[PDB]
Symmetry: D3
Subunit: 132 residues, 6 copies
């Protein structure tokens, strides 16, 4: 799934769309997405002026947007997140977002997310969603 | 503490600085910050085009920045967050960010954060920080 | 009137829409609007780098946009403005915009506007509009 | 006076600096400035989506910034403005800003401003400043 | 051809639309376009912080967009460019873009472009396009 | 060479810095740089609204910035470019920029640049620089 298709699946748009493509998809099971980290993204100017580092909260949003793609190919709002920010992410990194469904029902979904650069884990989260 | 002082305390800057002022401060104990939610903030164009709603992850970042102000008046990176997104936040809302210290040591800090509009709770989190 | 409705009433959009909500409305008479002032608004980076202060001309535009909301719930272009900038406005302020109609005709309208923070008057203006 | 010098004279910066160069200067008397109107300026996206027209309030700010250049080559805040918006200004226009000093004292200045495209007058204003 | 018409002819939009108006048009032969250079354009903040100068590559894009207008009034992608950057372009300059068709076929077009400030040549290019 | 070092070598900054890291460097000979292509970069909103594709002219600028890094680790302005845009580049692509020096003298440098995604060539250029 290329960026043009991702844009239509994900309701978020610039400057708050943090998926570039889908790399792997097992419906009702798992998705793997890619987000290129570019020094030319607007949030880096503010985080931080002296040192560009990807904000952990935006890794969480990327994981949530990957989950939404997984849901839709099988209005979702993040209902909760339990996240550990293990390692920092920099311009030049290719961020890999892996989502595994834990449980889905008509009104909610609970997933486990792992963010990786290469195959070093940089972020792990459990996310829950509601069907607003 | 007005915006000009907040700007110097918090290393984040536009478009990733999400505190406007400090309202209440008990050093080593508690801080209460204010973030005005304005429809003229850049992230609303992307979240969402059809319906401007504050991203929950940016409420988390606001809570984290309030904590950093509390730490400094007593390089902090979010190390973990356990957050429940209870209620949505809209342009026109005055977001109140209340941080209570749980435990601080030379190398880490753990806090409980509550975000409110009026005195309706919209977000609750436990946050941990490292001293990078 | 919430932001979503304001967005559809006012033809201006980001980064030039300076109303968040309507607080009070007496058709053909008076409107009271709210604009949250946020340090995360794009114009503050340029006015001024050393010290964020709301440009008076953008308070005028906010007053004009409030007037347009009042007109429409009863293409308007600012035709004239006679304005006194009394007191400065800062990130964290809730700007209250009060418009009273002086005279409306098929082709023009003349209003008196008052901008307040709390109930301290920060700006007073007489505005006229044409029906372009 | 080219843009690089204008940038240092005027405390405003992007996206709120609305002078490109100084064309004519008689100290303590008169200044003539130029502002190119470009469709690639950020405010046009919001004013208006369907039809790009320069906001009159930003012509006022341009006139005020020209005045500040005149003052400095002989912290100024707009204290008042009495302005008539005669004719619209579009991308592609070269906006000419002519400022004539009415009266200056240690603490205030009052000027008359005329904005022109070609030699058609598009805006006329009387402006006053304080020495904040 | 004013900006509103240019916007509909050219598929590029803010912040990548670099034509303001069409000044002269001989279909299947020649076009002359105008791009105002404004210090309030977003790319100047990055090129360069210490000294605003128009990037030569964006003059090339302006020449390419002028060519596309000429094509359409008689999806084009730049296929090649052979360009000499003779003289620098600054905020305050009115950039004149002159395109002469060399050869057009159903699937490609080759043009010669000259960019001028006043009638000093600042850029000369040969451009080719494909019909993607 | 990571992004933080690239930022100090290259005078361009956001939104006109198009290198993320240096991958390979043989002084006075060759450099290989990486630019992540992210759908969250500001130029994609304008090129094109319906379909995000990297502008070829910005690949040229990326090649020029890679060359400048090579020069400095051994004020450069693009003096000329002879470029063939072979294949399109999309959000999600990792753009590889390979520069080989042809000839350097005290006042000028001539290089050959190749841009690749994977090891498919997307752009080839000959660039010349002056020492402004």
């Amino acid at each position: 799934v290329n960026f043009e298709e991702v844009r239509e699946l994900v309701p978020q748009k610039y400057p708050f769309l943090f998926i570039d493509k889908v790399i792997e998809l097992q419906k009702e099971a798992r998705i793997v997405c890619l987000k290129n980290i570019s020094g030319n993204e607007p949030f880096f100017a503010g985080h931080f002026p002296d040192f560009a580092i990807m904000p952990g909260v935006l890794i969480v949003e990327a994981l949530a947007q990957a989950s939404i793609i997984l849901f839709k190919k099988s209005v979702f709002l993040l209902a909760s997140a339990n996240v550990r920010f293990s390692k920092p992410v920099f311009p030049g990194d290719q961020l890999i977002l892996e989502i595994d469904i834990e449980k889905v029902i008509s009104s909610a979904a609970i997933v486990k997310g792992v963010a990786k650069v290469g195959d070093k884990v940089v972020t792990k989260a459990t996310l829950s969603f509601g069907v607003a």
